[PDB]
């Protein structure tokens, strides 16, 4: 990439998922752009966090809005039990990234799809430019995979720790990790976006949060 | 990598008041097997040393350590101990830090004063209490030893354990085999046994 986005960090608590990313687009060692929203809400039950190539990220943003528009075609239940699921969005994105890699024209990004399924299960899965996908109770990209993940894994070490984790604890851990990432990552920013997807209260998008 | 040119493996194990050191006998030139009598285990007094890696390096190091331990015995009027010999091996190896011998040395022995079994791996000393492996099949040896080893084995049980580990690691290594020798080392006696194995 040339203009790049830094880490996206995420975790799942007892009633949903939290995902955060900062609002900065780096140009090498130059901190060039400071209004880059890298959390992409898709519907009301899914947030797509993108890192890496900003131009490829803007391409994925377009692909996600087209996917929402196509789903509503001839679908009277598009705002209903026939809406796009986090698993549907991830599978589409994973297919695109894998097909791009196989054509030697990869979308140079790491994507975390965060959301809650219709049955209430937390969805938190990752995909990168190579098409490598995995899920975990906590996920992070780039720099956060090395520094934010240890702090989040201290809160949710395994799957049985998820029901014991409240939204306040999860959000406090995510904000602490964002502060730590600001201190030790040179390509990071004080300003970050935070999205909470809860199976009960729905999507909560918080913008311009400051370390 | 000159260590894989000749092949061969060395494994050492501690038992109850005893140590065992074992090696394969294959001297190879890449895939070609040259000699089946290249014993990689040497002893200087009551301290045993197994050397894997480049065979010329093995011979050079054996000569150097015979030299140094002979001078040690002449100066000190006592035979060198396994821990002192381990320090000697480490210092000799780091004496050639940028001209290194392509070897993996394994020290086995029992301290004559304390009577405690001693094994060591390597310049940085890995003074393990259970087992030391070295050679081209070090991963196979690690698997076999980690699965088979249990503490405080009697000399017969220790022989069976180290023999099975060596044989089954050598079976899965292309450049190890053509026979094997096991030394069961105790304070009073040292038994040398040649193992029957596949000759391919």
């Amino acid at each position: 990439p040339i203009v790049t986005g830094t880490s996206v960090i995420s975790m799942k608590y007892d009633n949903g998922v939290i995902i955060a990313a900062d609002n900065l687009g780096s140009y090498g060692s130059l901190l060039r752009f400071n209004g880059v929203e890298r959390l992409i809400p898709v519907g009301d039950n899914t947030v797509v966090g993108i890192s890496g190539d900003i131009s490829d990220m803007q391409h994925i943003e377009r692909l996600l809005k087209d996917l929402v528009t196509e789903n509503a075609y001839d679908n009277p239940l598009a705002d209903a039990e026939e809406a796009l699921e986090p698993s549907y969005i991830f599978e589409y994105l994973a297919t695109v990234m894998y097909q791009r890699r196989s054509k030697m024209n990869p979308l140079w990004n790491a994507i975390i799809v965060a959301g809650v399924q219709s049955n209430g299960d937390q969805f938190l899965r990752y995909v990168n430019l190579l098409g490598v996908t995995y899920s975990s109770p906590t996920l992070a990209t780039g720099f956060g995979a090395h520094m934010a993940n240890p702090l989040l894994r201290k809160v949710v070490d395994r799957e049985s720790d998820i029901p014991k984790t409240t939204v306040q604890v999860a959000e406090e851990a995510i904000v602490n990790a964002m502060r730590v990432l600001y201190y030790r990552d040179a390509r990071s920013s004080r300003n970050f976006s935070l999205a909470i997807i809860d199976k009960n209260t729905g999507l909560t998008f918080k913008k311009n949060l400051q370390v | 990598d000159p260590s894989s040119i000749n092949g061969g493996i060395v494994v050492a194990m501690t038992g109850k008041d005893c140590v065992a050191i074992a090696c394969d006998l294959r001297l190879g030139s890449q895939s070609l097997g040259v000699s089946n009598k290249f014993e990689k285990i040497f002893h200087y007094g009551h301290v045993f040393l197994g050397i894997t890696g480049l065979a010329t390096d093995v011979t050079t190091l054996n000569e150097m350590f015979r030299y140094k331990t002979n001078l040690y015995k002449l100066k000190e009027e006592r035979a060198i101990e396994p821990e002192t010999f381990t320090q000697l091996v480490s210092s000799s190896l780091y004496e050639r830090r940028f001209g290194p011998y392509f070897v993996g040395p394994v020290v086995a022995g029992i301290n004559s004063k304390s009577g405690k079994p001693f094994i060591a791996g390597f310049g940085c000393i890995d003074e393990a209490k259970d087992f030391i492996v070295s050679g081209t099949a070090s991963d196979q040896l690690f698997g076999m030893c980690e699965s088979l080893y249990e503490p405080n084995l009697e000399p017969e049980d220790l022989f069976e354990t180290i023999s099975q580990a060596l044989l089954n690691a050598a079976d899965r290594d292309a450049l190890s085999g053509w026979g094997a020798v096991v030394y069961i080392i105790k304070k009073d006696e040292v038994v040398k046994r040649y193992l029957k194995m596949r000759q391919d």
């Binding site: 990439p1 040339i2 203009v3 687009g25 140009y27 130059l30 060039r32 752009f33 209004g35 190539d53 900003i54 131009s55 990220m57 803007q58 391409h59 | -």
Partner: protein, 183 residues
């Protein structure tokens, strides 16, 4: 090169230097770097793509009416993605600046700077730029900014060419070294 576009209270001003170099050789020192892609949409590089964009925008105008600066940047991106500063004036948008760095991403900014000489004025332009500047303040801001960029960048020099895009029309301004160097 040192190129900058600044939105102000009545529109947008695109300013650039006039020096093109091949190493240490100044091949052209009267270059016109501000390029018209549509009536009141102008772009600058930090040349074939400008021809295709003008082709596409002319096609858009015949079929879908006057394009906006965003449409020009959209066409620029769809060709670049598959360093450009795009500045333009529209009645409803009242002047917009779009920067498209080398990666192919598009950013809408109150002002943009690009080129080898833009690095030396990142500190200066941040401190001195103000929203809703007057036309003379904006010209002064660009004149002071590019002069510093010209002073420190060996690839920047010559005259400072300016294109003012407002509702009144397109105004071309030229500033010679004897004027801006003494600023």
């Amino acid at each position: 090169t040192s190129i900058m576009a600044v939105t102000f209270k009545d529109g947008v001003i695109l300013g650039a230097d006039s020096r093109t170099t091949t190493g240490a050789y100044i091949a052209n020192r009267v270059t016109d770097k501000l390029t018209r892609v549509h009536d009141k949409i102008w772009c600058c590089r930090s040349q074939a793509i400008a021809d295709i964009v003008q082709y596409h925008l002319e096609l858009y105008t015949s079929q879908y009416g006057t394009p906006s600066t965003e449409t020009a940047a959209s066409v620029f991106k769809e060709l670049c993605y598959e360093g450009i500063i795009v500045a333009g004036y529209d009645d409803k948008n009242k002047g917009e600046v779009y920067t498209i760095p080398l990666g192919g991403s598009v950013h809408k900014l109150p002002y943009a700077i690009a080129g080898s000489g833009s690095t030396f004025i990142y500190g200066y332009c941040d401190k001195n730029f103000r929203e809703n500047m007057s036309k003379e303040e904006t010209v002064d801001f660009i004149k002071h900014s590019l002069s510093q960029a010209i002073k420190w960048d060996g690839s920047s020099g010559g005259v400072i060419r300016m294109v003012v895009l407002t509702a009144a029309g397109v105004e071309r301004l030229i500033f010679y070294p004897d004027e801006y160097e003494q600023l």
